[PDB]
Amino acid sequence: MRISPELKKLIEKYRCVKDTEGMSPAKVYKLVGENENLYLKMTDSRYKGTTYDVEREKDMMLWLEGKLPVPKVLHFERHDGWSNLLMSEADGVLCSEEYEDEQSPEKIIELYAECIRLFHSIDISDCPYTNSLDSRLAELDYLLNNDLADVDCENWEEDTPFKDPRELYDFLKTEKPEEELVFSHGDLGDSNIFVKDGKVSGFIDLGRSGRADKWYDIAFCVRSIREDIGEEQYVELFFDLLGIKPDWEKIKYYILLDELF
Amino acid sequence: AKMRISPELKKLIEKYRCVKDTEGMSPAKVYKLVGENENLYLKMTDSRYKGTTYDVEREKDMMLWLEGKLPVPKVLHFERHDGWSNLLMSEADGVLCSEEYEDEQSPEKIIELYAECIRLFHSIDISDCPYTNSLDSRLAELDYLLNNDLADVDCENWEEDTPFKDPRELYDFLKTEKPEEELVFSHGDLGDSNIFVKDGKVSGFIDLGRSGRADKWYDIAFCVRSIREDIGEEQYVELFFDLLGIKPDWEKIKYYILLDELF
Ligand SMILES: NCCNS(=O)(=O)c1ccc(Cl)c2ccncc12
Ligand SMILES: NCCNS(=O)(=O)c1ccc(Cl)c2ccncc12
Ligand SMILES: [Ca+2]
Ligand SMILES: [Ca+2]
């Protein structure tokens, strides 16, 4: 059945719609109700205790209550190997949508800068998870060995500098940079930030959130900017807003790290 | 070491730009390979699915058998590599049916196309068909999928208006109410995203892992389900059976639509 009798009873009066598998390997179901939407997010036991495990996402959502705008945890359970999280819908409009037609590079970059600022204001002394590079790399070793890592187009392309996934891993292992831990979203992108009245209104997709180096989220922003918006001058703009000098070695490193995840 | 595809295959596709497909064929992974003279498609399924109608090896076998019988993609390369089954194939010919009806307001042309498919399938000589997807076969495979939590458990098992407490009860029902069967060639997952059209006539089929011998009401039932949830009006269902020249056996139609839920 995958969900418990209790959870089924909770979600009964909602119309269930499978999401487009945007959060694969997690299964996401939109639950359309009369007065609101709920989201049910599920991950199987192969992902237990990794940064994909929604139990992990649930823990961070509870800890983040009162520190960052996040959906409310409504129900959580382990059932028949599955981790099942039922949550409220984020407030505001999804970034990718808010700026869908907005050819405004300036606004998403401004939004990225605000997120980084918000993150650095969060006290991580009691943060439930530490996603230091030793932890991420141990996890990556495990995913690789159990054929759960995300091997695809970026390992097969002729243009790849590494002959295979394990070559990229060894590089990540030996070139590990020094780290200064701060709160980190883990997968910061326009598909999981919500905005409302020009202000950040919510974050979702928090399974990879916790302590990590400050250049990790920054690196993701640089990658977003370059992928969408095409011009490198918007990268320089991003760093003027942050008011810091980019560390390209670290930025390159974190972008490579995400390839297998 | 953990490439998923062999060096031979990596090499074959080197000159192509790789792009992940919509993921509408889960649990298969599909990659569109954009080149200068054509596009290829790489479709991969993992070892949990070996032996089942999800395994692309079975789809490859059917595609080789169908060459010259139905318009289908060409098998460019197939391999087993590290538990994976990998199939490289050409692009279908024509326009995807759900895109020709994109905005044409031609509901009857969809109905005509479905009826054409059914007639085409009935004309296929299956004397040497590699697979027999009889109800015994499908139910044995469904048993295995449920035992390993590989069945498609989702909304349909969770809704308030579900007639079955759990997936097993559905299975025992399907096993108990097994209708009699008249085998003909069957696509196995006939739908608007699987049928290509060129010049008002069918021009290609994809998604063939579930194809082989099955009862004639199987594909017909999928058409009725498609017509109702895509078009809506019941007059197009009556038109469908009129074009087929047969009266609908609703007990069998409902049976096969039910069968597909866990898949
Ligand atoms: N990028 C998410 C697209 N759909 S969404 O924004 O409504 C959405 C998708 C998935 C989950 Cl788990 C959510 C949770 C809370 N709010 C919106 C959620
Ligand atoms: N619903 C399928 C639409 N995308 S498609 O028609 O281009 C397509 C998708 C997936 C595969 Cl494997 C294909 C193979 C051959 N031709 C088109 C193929
Ligand atoms: Ca990847
Ligand atoms: Ca189902």
Residue numbers in the entry:
A (entry chain A): 4 to 264
B (entry chain B): 2 to 264
Show me the paper's own sentences about this structure.
For aminoglycosides, a group of antibiotics used to treat serious nosocomial infections, the main mechanism of resistance is via the enzymatic inactivation of the drug by acetyltransferases, nucleotidyltransferases, or phosphotransferases. Among the three types of aminoglycoside-modifying enzymes, aminoglycoside phosphotransferases or kinases (APHs) yield the highest levels of resistance thereby providing a rationale for focusing inhibitor development for these specific resistance factors. Combined, these studies reveal that although members of the APH family share low similarities in sequence and their ligand specificity varies greatly, their overall three-dimensional fold is homologous to each other and to that of ePKs. To further examine the suitability of the CKI-7 scaffold for inhibitor development, we determined the crystal structures of APH(3′)-IIIa and APH(9)-Ia in complex with CKI-7.
Previously, details on the inhibition of APH(3′)-IIIa by CKI-7 have been reported (Ki = 66.1±7.5 µM). The APH(3′)-IIIa-CKI-7 inhibitor complex was crystallized in the space group P212121 with two inhibitor-bound enzyme molecules in the asymmetric unit, analogous to the nucleotide bound enzyme complexes. The structure has been refined to 2.15 Å with an Rcryst of 0.189 and Rfree of 0.235. In the nucleotide-bound enzyme structures, the loop is positioned above the phosphate moieties of the nucleotide, whereas, in the APH(3′)-IIIa-CKI-7 structure, the tip of the loop points back into the phosphate-binding area, delimiting the nucleotide-binding pocket, reminiscent of what is seen in the apo state of APH(3′)-IIIa. A principal contact between the isoquinoline or adenine ring with APH is the stacking interactions conferred by the aromatic ring side chain of Tyr42 in APH(3′)-IIIa and Phe50 in APH(9)-Ia. Consequently, an interaction analogous to that between N1 of the adenine and the linker amide is observed between N2 of the isoquinoline and the amide of Ala93 in APH(3′)-IIIa or Ile103 in APH(9)-Ia. In APH(3′)-IIIa, the aminoethyl-amide adopts an extended conformation and it is situated just beyond the ribose-binding area, toward the solvent exposed opening of the ATP-binding pocket. Two hydrogen bonds are observed between this section of the CKI-7 and the APH(3′)-IIIa. One of which is found between one of the oxygen atoms of the sulfonyl group (O2S) and the hydroxyl group of Tyr42. The second hydrogen bond is formed between the terminal nitrogen of the aminoethyl tail, N2′, and the main chain carbonyl of Ser194.
